[PDB]
Amino acid sequence: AVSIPINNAGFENPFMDVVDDYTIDTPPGWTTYDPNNLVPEKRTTWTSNNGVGYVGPGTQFYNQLAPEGRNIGYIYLSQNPGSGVAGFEQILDATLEPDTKYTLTVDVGNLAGTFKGLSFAGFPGYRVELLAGDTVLAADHNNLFIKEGEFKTSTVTYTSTAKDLHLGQKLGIRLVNLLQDKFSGLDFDNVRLTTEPT
Amino acid sequence: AVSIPINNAGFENPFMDVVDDYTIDTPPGWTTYDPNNLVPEKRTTWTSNNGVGYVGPGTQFYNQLAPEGRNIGYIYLSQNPGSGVAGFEQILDATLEPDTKYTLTVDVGNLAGTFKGLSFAGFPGYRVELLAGDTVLAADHNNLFIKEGEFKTSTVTYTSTAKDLHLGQKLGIRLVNLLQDKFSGLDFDNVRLTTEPT
Numbered sequence: 001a002v003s004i005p006i007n008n009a010g011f012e013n014p015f016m017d018v019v020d021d022y023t024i025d026t027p028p029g030w031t032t033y034d035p036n037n038l039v040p041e042k043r044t045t046w047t048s049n050n051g052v053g054y055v056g057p058g059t060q061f062y063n064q065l066a067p068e069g070r071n072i073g074y075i076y077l078s079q080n081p082g083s084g085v086a087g088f089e090q091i092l093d094a095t096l097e098p099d100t101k102y103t104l105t106v107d108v109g110n111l112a113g114t115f116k117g118l119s120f121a122g123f124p125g126y127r128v129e130l131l132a133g134d135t136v137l138a139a140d141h142n143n144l145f146i147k148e149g150e151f152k153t154s155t156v157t158y159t160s161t162a163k164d165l166h167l168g169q170k171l172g173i174r175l176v177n178l179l180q181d182k183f184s185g186l187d188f189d190n191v192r193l194t195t196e197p198t
Numbered sequence: 199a200v201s202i203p204i205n206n207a208g209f210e211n212p213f214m215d216v217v218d219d220y221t222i223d224t225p226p227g228w229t230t231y232d233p234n235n236l237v238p239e240k241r242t243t244w245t246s247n248n249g250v251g252y253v254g255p256g257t258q259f260y261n262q263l264a265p266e267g268r269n270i271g272y273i274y275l276s277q278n279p280g281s282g283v284a285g286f287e288q289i290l291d292a293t294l295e296p297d298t299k300y301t302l303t304v305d306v307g308n309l310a311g312t313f314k315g316l317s318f319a320g321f322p323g324y325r326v327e328l329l330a331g332d333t334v335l336a337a338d339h340n341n342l343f344i345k346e347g348e349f350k351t352s353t354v355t356y357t358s359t360a361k362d363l364h365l366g367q368k369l370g371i372r373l374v375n376l377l378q379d380k381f382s383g384l385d386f387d388n389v390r391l392t393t394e395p396t
């Protein structure tokens with residue numbers, strides 16, 4: 001298996017100085033996936049947003065460190081459950097090749113605890129998608145159980161054929177908060193994509 | 199793990215006398231899932247339809263028999279790729295219970311060969327969904343590679359918590375043809391759902 005490079009794959013940029021601090025602007029390498037217009041252009045804390053968070057020693061919200069490095073990438077939706085889905089997207093330069101198995105892996109985090117009166121109990125559900133063009137080739141919609149305060153690795157696989165309709169289209173990755181329950185913040189880290197062509 | 203009963207779980211009803219024959223009406227136990235209005239009420243062969251098919255000895259379209267029994271359940275969409283998704287749905291009497299792991303398994307078939315000038319080469323993609331009410335709790339969107347002429351088992355899992363928003367809602371199953379490529383017929387068989395509550 002050969003790795004396909006992913007920009008800002010660990011959400012390590014921007015660098016953060018203080019544990020549990022966070023940015024509220026889309027991290028470099030990624031764009032905001034927002035089909036239901038839940039995330040504003042002008043960002044503020046306490047409203048729907050995305051960014052990075054420093055999950056380091058002494059974090060109050062996990063029983064572990066970030067899966068990789070210092071930071072995680074998060075999507076927080078304050079709208080009520082059922083309002084839509086949102087998250088991160090990254091379109092790669094690599095294109096879909098025939099007779100190839102693609103393996104997309106990402107760690108998904110269930111924030112625990114409470115912050116200034118807002119409980120982090122509960123989890124909104126996640127979906128990890130592998131795209132070619134605008135088509136979702138394969139996705140893991142919420143199959144893993146993630147305990148409060150831990151991360152778990154999601155794996156998504158797709159195998160192309162020699163006559164796949166989407167051959168030559170750009171590969172893409174989406175990391176989605178399903179907003180199916182509250183607390184509706186969701187963390188991701190350590191994105192990896194491999195191929196095993198013939 | 200305790201099995202939850204599923205009506206017409208193997209698509210064995212109606213009974214079929216001739217290998218490779220098929221019905222074009224929704225099988226009992228299931229309804230037609232058709233969010234994009236691709237499947238007509240008045241059914242004809244050669245247009246979008248669903249039904250059962252007898253995959254028995256001497257079948258021309260598989261290198262194996264039906265996963266279970268005589269028949270499979272199919273969804274055939276003749277619209278072009280990208281037109282929408284359709285399939286089967288079944289709403290169960292069982293309701294979502296707290297602190298329970300649900301395991302949904304179904305065999306998915308990739309029809310092979312050709313029939314009267316129409317090639318069965320290619321595969322449209324599948325999605326298997328576990329529902330509570332109208333919410334997709336978990337789904338396997340097309341993660342398995344299925345060779346031409348075989349079936350493979352898809353597994354979908356969901357673990358509920360003690361305060362799940364959808365507790366007490368009816369469980370449901372959807373079996374979906376993604377219409378992401380042609381040939382855009384898709385087979386299913388041997389649906390099973392288990393729970394492992396505390």
Ligand SMILES: NC(=[NH2+])NCCC[C@@H]1NC(=O)[C@H]2CCCN2C1=O
Pocket residue numbers: 020021022044045046047049052053054055061072074076111115118185186187
């Ligand atoms: N997901 C993390 N580990 N840390 C950052 C969370 C930031 C995210 N966005 C916000 O505006 C804050 C408000 C309170 C809860 N928040 C969130 O969940």
Ligand SMILES: NC(=[NH2+])NCCC[C@@H]1NC(=O)[C@H]2CCCN2C1=O
Pocket residue numbers: 218219220242243244245247250251252253259270272274309313316383384385
């Ligand atoms: N899926 C099976 N194993 N058998 C039945 C297929 C029936 C399904 N519906 C139809 O009207 C026929 C037309 C030709 C191709 N068909 C299909 O794929």
Ligand SMILES: [Ca+2]
Pocket residue numbers: 010011012066067068069070071072189190
């Ligand atoms: Ca990281």
Ligand SMILES: [Ca+2]
Pocket residue numbers: 110111112113120121122123148149183
């Ligand atoms: Ca939580």
Ligand SMILES: [Ca+2]
Pocket residue numbers: 208209210264265266267268269270387388
């Ligand atoms: Ca059967």
Ligand SMILES: [Ca+2]
Pocket residue numbers: 308309310311318319320321346347381
């Ligand atoms: Ca086929």
